[PDB]
Design a protein around this ligand. Sequence first.
Ligand SMILES: COc1ccncc1CC(=O)N1CCC[C@@H](C(N)=O)C1
Ligand SMILES: [Zn+2]
Length: 139
Amino acid sequence: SGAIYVGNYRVVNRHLATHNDWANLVWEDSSRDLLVSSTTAQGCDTIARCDCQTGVYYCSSRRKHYPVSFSKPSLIFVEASEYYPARYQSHLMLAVGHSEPGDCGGILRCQHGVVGIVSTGGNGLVGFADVRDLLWLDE
Ligand SMILES: COc1ccncc1CC(=O)N1CCC[C@@H](C(N)=O)C1
Ligand SMILES: [Zn+2]
């Protein structure tokens, strides 16, 4: 679990979005596993605007943060779940690192701010849904 709170928006994994998220829907993209909903309270997370390929992510299944090198956002094949059939997930960045399904939502951050959130994993890899291209989150 986990979310990013920026201005009047909450960014979550689309597969973990709640009824309140879908009733206050701003934007969603199944191909990215992202959903953004509106909030009443103001958020203070800073979104990174950069091409960093190194950062730190939170891993809830280890109660730890790990430093990683990650790939640039791209289309990557992802196995089926109860949420999606097998498909290419877009804007996904991969790194070598531990993850489990409940780790989705953990933040990846560089020195500039929030880069994205854990969205996939398996076989010792972890994948993060990028948010740095969503320039509208700041206005
Ligand atoms: C962090 O995720 C995991 C890690 C290890 N084994 C499995 C997982 C779970 C996983 O990959 N999922 C969860 C359901 C949505 C899927 C998607 N984005 O299409 C990804
Ligand atoms: Zn950066």
